[PDB]
Write an enzyme that holds these catalytic residues in place. Structure first.
Site, short mmCIF file in Angstrom:
data_model
loop_
_atom_site.label_atom_id
_atom_site.label_comp_id
_atom_site.label_asym_id
_atom_site.label_seq_id
_atom_site.Cartn_x
_atom_site.Cartn_y
_atom_site.Cartn_z
N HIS A 30 11.50 -5.87 -27.06
CA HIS A 30 10.32 -5.30 -26.41
C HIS A 30 9.35 -6.39 -25.95
CE1 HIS A 30 6.35 -3.22 -26.37
NE2 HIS A 30 7.04 -2.15 -26.03
N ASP A 36 -3.54 7.39 -4.44
CA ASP A 36 -2.14 7.46 -4.03
C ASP A 36 -1.22 8.05 -5.09
OD1 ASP A 36 -2.92 6.34 -1.65
OD2 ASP A 36 -2.49 4.29 -2.28
N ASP A 63 -8.44 2.51 -17.16
CA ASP A 63 -9.06 1.78 -16.08
C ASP A 63 -8.17 1.61 -14.86
OD1 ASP A 63 -11.58 0.93 -17.60
OD2 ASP A 63 -9.96 0.25 -18.92
N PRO A 91 -13.65 0.68 -24.87
CA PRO A 91 -14.14 0.71 -23.48
C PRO A 91 -14.14 -0.66 -22.80
CG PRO A 91 -15.56 1.99 -24.94
CD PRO A 91 -14.65 1.19 -25.82
N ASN A 111 2.02 6.49 -24.88
CA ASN A 111 3.13 7.24 -24.29
C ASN A 111 3.21 8.65 -24.87
OD1 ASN A 111 3.92 4.67 -23.05
ND2 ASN A 111 4.91 4.18 -25.03
N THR A 168 0.81 -1.21 0.00
CA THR A 168 0.00 0.00 0.00
C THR A 168 0.84 1.26 0.00
OG1 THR A 168 -0.14 -0.13 2.40
CG2 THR A 168 -1.97 -1.03 1.15
N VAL A 176 -12.03 -3.32 -22.91
CA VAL A 176 -10.77 -3.91 -22.48
C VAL A 176 -10.17 -3.06 -21.37
CG1 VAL A 176 -10.39 -4.95 -24.77
CG2 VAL A 176 -9.35 -2.74 -24.21
#
Ligand SMILES: N=C(N)N1CCCCC1
Length: 279
Positions: free
Chosen positions: A69, A260, A200, A175, A161, A16, A177
């Site tokens: 990658h 956070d 998300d 929306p 990015n 956390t 995925v």
């Protein structure tokens, strides 16, 4: 289980608070699940995959990862030292060439391949696809992602990015995925991470150590590195029976560390992927 001196991202998803270096996780470790890494390929022979990685499809002259990658992403999903789900099975689908580029029709073809191929494979705990790629908005690319998700695969995709609203990128903007933004080790949004209501969840994406081609390792940054943290977390959670392919993204959002992260724009979720492992 507990991996000390873990890469900061693994430690982050099991805490956390930031700044820890131990990755605490259930020893099932995603055994019985399968993750398709749709990318530049995977160097399956890399020792860090322990024979748990295999190429199943390529759209180019070779199945080999001549970039690194895809191997790096695959290592964050499920490699021994750098992976979230250290016992998952990894399947490589090379839709990007060795420069990291791919045309949209090839990417779409690869997604449809996975939707069918998963019916050839023993994945009793469920199937995940991690897509650390994208480009400009395309309704056909979005529908391909949505078809994959609908077929029973938990699809996680990179936000992009561009430090911009991901509504303008695909498959990020689909929306249905799981669209993943990137965070750094001080819980800031990564400077390059896209944002927007279509995101998300966030995962660690700055300075992420993982496998590289030639049996090596390196640290690189991108929402491409955040995406496999979430894909590996989903495989891990589906092995624990806590969620399914259809609900994993919602479940990960519901159980995330909330509020956070810093430098999150208004309208973008403040949620950081978290395994809530209680030893
Ligand atoms: N090297 C790996 N995969 N580790 C190190 C220590 C405990 C389990 C995870």
């Amino acid at each position: 289980a507990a991996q000390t001196n873990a890469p900061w991202g693994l430690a982050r998803i099991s805490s956390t608070s930031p700044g820890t270096s131990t990755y605490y996780y259930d020893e099932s470790a995603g055994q019985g699940s399968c993750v398709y890494v749709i990318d530049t390929g995977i160097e399956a022979s890399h020792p860090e995959f322990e024979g748990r990685a295999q190429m199943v499809k390529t759209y180019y002259y070779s199945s080999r990862d001549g970039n690194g990658h895809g191997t790096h992403c695959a290592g964050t999903v499920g490699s021994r030292t750098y992976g979230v789900a250290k016992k998952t099975q990894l399947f490589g689908v090379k839709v990007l060439d060795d420069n990291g580029s791919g045309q949209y029709s090839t990417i779409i073809a690869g997604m449809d391949f996975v939707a069918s191929d998963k019916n050839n494979r023993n994945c009793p705990k469920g199937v995940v696809a991690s897509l650390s790629l994208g480009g400009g908005y395309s309704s056909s690319v979005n529908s391909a992602a949505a078809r994959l998700q609908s077929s029973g695969v938990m699809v996680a995709v990179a936000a992009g990015n561009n430090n911009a609203d991901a509504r303008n990128y695909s498959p990020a903007s689909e929306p249905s995925v799981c669209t993943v933004g990137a965070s750094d080790r001080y819980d800031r949004r990564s400077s390059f991470s896209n944002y927007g209501s279509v995101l998300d969840i966030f995962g660690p994406g700055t300075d992420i150590l993982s496998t590289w081609i030639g049996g090596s390792t390196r640290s690189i940054s991108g929402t491409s590195m955040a995406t496999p943290h979430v894909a590996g977390l989903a495989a891990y959670l589906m092995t624990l029976g806590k969620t399914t392919a259809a609900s994993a993204c919602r479940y990960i959002a519901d159980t995330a560390n909330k509020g956070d992260l810093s430098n999150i724009p208004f309208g973008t979720v403040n949620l950081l992927a978290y395994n809530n492992y209680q030893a």
